[PDB]
């Protein structure tokens, strides 16, 4: 069926430009409009423009008239979007959507405009103990600390463990770095035989970490 996979999140220094890709698959890439929408953190969406891969016809909204340039590559069924003269206000999630009315959307790409240095996270286990085991169930998780910029992805046992998982929105520390936790609730009776591992992915820095979480005497 119809798919739209976008490139991963990245950091860009103010004044610079960035190119976001959007791979299409499952339909006639050339005979259908491709939109680019912007999501301002916490405040609505903004249409940016479209492109008809067929004849390469493009439309832009006054705002991004000269700040964005849209292109497409039929041989790859990929739509690209370049953004120039990036400012701090340009930090947002950018999506691509198929058809003139956005019938299908990509997962989106968070672009952070900042002169701050990129930094991969530290991953510390939140170990299960009598202090984290309620009536028959135990809670355990991972502390993903000190990373920049957002986002960071968390999965348990390579995606096999998703039931009862909570991954909290990140908090901003004084240091200007981010921090968050991911927890899971399982049977306390299984801590002796089941294995739990959090998979932490921070694309902006091509960083991947796996931490084994074992019980602790407490």
């Amino acid at each position: 069926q119809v798919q739209l996979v976008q490139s991963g999140a990245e950091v860009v220094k103010p004044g610079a430009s960035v190119k976001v890709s959007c791979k299409a698959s499952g339909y006639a890439f050339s005979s259908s409009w491709m939109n680019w929408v912007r999501q301002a953190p916490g405040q609505g969406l903004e249409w940016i423009g479209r492109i008809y891969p067929g004849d390469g016809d493009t439309n832009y909204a006054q705002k991004f008239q000269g700040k964005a340039t849209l292109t497409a590559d039929k041989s790859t069924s990929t739509a690209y979007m370049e953004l120039s003269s990036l400012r701090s206000e340009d930090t947002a999630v950018y999506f691509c959507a198929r058809e003139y009315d956005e019938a299908y959307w990509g997962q989106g790409t968070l672009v952070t405009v900042s002169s701050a240095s990129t930094k991969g996270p530290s991953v510390f286990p939140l170990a299960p103990s009598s202090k984290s085991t309620s009536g028959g169930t135990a809670a355990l998780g991972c502390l993903v600390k000190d990373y920049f910029p957002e986002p960071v992805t968390v999965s348990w046992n390579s995606g096999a463990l998703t039931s009862g998982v909570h991954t909290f929105p990140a908090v901003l520390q004084s240091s200007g770095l981010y921090s968050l936790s991911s927890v899971v609730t399982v049977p306390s009776s299984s801590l002796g035989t089941q294995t739990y591992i959090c998979n932490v992915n921070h694309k902006p820095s091509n960083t991947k970490v796996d931490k084994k979480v074992e019980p602790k005497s407490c």
Binding site: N35, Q43, G44, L45, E46, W47, N59, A61, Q62, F95, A97, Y100, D101, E102, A103, Y104, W105, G106, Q107, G108, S122, F124, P125, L126, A127, S129, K131, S132, S134, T137, A139, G141, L143, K145, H166, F168, P169, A170, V171, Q173, S179, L180, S181, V183, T185, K216, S217, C218
Partner: protein, 219 residues
């Protein structure tokens, strides 16, 4: 810019009950052609949008029946006959009749459920974090409702302030509950100057406050 006004901005409903949202533009979204281009999008927290209703009334492949689209002129409205847990998220209406395309501010739909007290868990610092010189103590409030919850940190029975950060999740799409985490972060030196670390929880679903604690030693 045709201006898209959405209302209400927030809306909590109880499971099954009906819900309605409104969207009023600033000019007929009716094209010279016999069609009006106005859609409704649903956006789960942190997820990508999903078109629910296009062309004002036509639904969309794989979409519940309780979702109906109507209205016209410049007064369109979405309607959910039987709102359900799964319906949580932000709804938006988009106009594609003029130029450029514009969206409404969105409407956050929340589910009102029965009070549910949180389960409280506490986690001591990992030995590896201590090596780095810092120490994070985490207190977890799991699957509770309503959202309002008061958590406080006490070290050796001395109330704390200015050393913790908390974060609350989106409303669960299955049980409609929330979870919250409070993290006390202090230096290794300071973590070593004290013995007892306790988390105190106060929530409408608890007859009496709840305290989870541990001794730095025995742990």
């Amino acid at each position: 810019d045709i201006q898209m006004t959405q209302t209400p901005l927030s809306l909590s409903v109880t499971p099954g009950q009906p819900a309605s949202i409104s969207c009023k533009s600033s000019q007929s979204l009716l094209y010279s052609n016999g069609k009006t281009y106005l859609n409704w999008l649903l956006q789960k927290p942190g997820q990508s949008p999903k078109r629910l209703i296009y062309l004002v009334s036509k639904l969309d492949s794989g979409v519940p029946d309780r979702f109906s689209g109507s209205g016209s002129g410049t007064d369109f409205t979405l309607k959910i006959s039987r709102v359900e847990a799964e319906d949580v998220g932000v709804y938006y209406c988009v106009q594609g009749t003029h130029f450029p395309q514009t969206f409404g501010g969105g409407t956050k739909v929340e589910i009102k459920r029965t009070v549910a007290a949180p389960s409280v868990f506490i986690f001591p610092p990992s030995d590896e974090q201590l090596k780095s010189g810092t120490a994070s103590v985490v207190c977890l409030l799991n699957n509770f409702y309503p959202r309002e919850a008061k958590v406080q940190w006490k070290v050796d029975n001395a109330l704390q302030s200015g050393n913790s950060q908390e974060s609350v999740t989106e409303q669960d799409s299955k049980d409609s509950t929330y979870s919250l985490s409070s993290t006390l972060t202090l230096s290794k030196a300071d973590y070593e100057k004290h013995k007892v670390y306790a988390c105190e929880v106060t929530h409408q679903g608890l007859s009496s406050p709840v305290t989870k604690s541990f001794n730095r030693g025995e742990c």
